[PDB]
Amino acid sequence: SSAYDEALATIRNDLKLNFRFKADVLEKNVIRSILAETKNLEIDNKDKDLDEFKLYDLLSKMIKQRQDSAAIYLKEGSPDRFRQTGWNELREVDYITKYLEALPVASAEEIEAKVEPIVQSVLEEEGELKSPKEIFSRIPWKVVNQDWQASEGAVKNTVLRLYNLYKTD
């Protein structure tokens, strides 16, 4: 939990700087929102230790939630008078992605550099690709934390993205 505690210190520090120098208001909402979900996260994972990978999936959910909300607003309109709700969702995604990319985990290219040899090797041994479930099997979902340095979910996204590229049906 050394990396998790160090990571949550920078988020707290950016909160102290934001109040000190009156930085962007929306950033204050992002950090305050992250800390509350961290507060919920600590309660439900006590004594289990907190690796940064479990923090990675927390920020991943926040990024995915606001992207879904942004998609609806950027198609049917924001409800506020100034029509800024849809763009506010995406602005927060950038703030959350800034901390997500600072965690000591693999980037999108490193995880793809390990799953792509597996997706291709599945298709050549079998001919046609129907579902990602045949690619999840050849993934060691027990030791991808120090050989790959990735969470449980970031590998899921990489496979699903690669599957949609390689699928033959």
């Binding site: 291709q120 050549e124 690669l162």
Partner: peptide, 28 residues
């Protein structure tokens, strides 16, 4: 037995363009 011609990449990345194993159609 049957092998691909030279200068055929084993991987590529062109955004969302579908990724497929190169098939030399002359051999069909």
């Amino acid at each position: 037995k049957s092998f691909l011609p030279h200068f055929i990449p084993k991987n590529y990345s062109y955004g969302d363009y579908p990724r497929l194993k190169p098939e030399n159609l002359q051999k069909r």
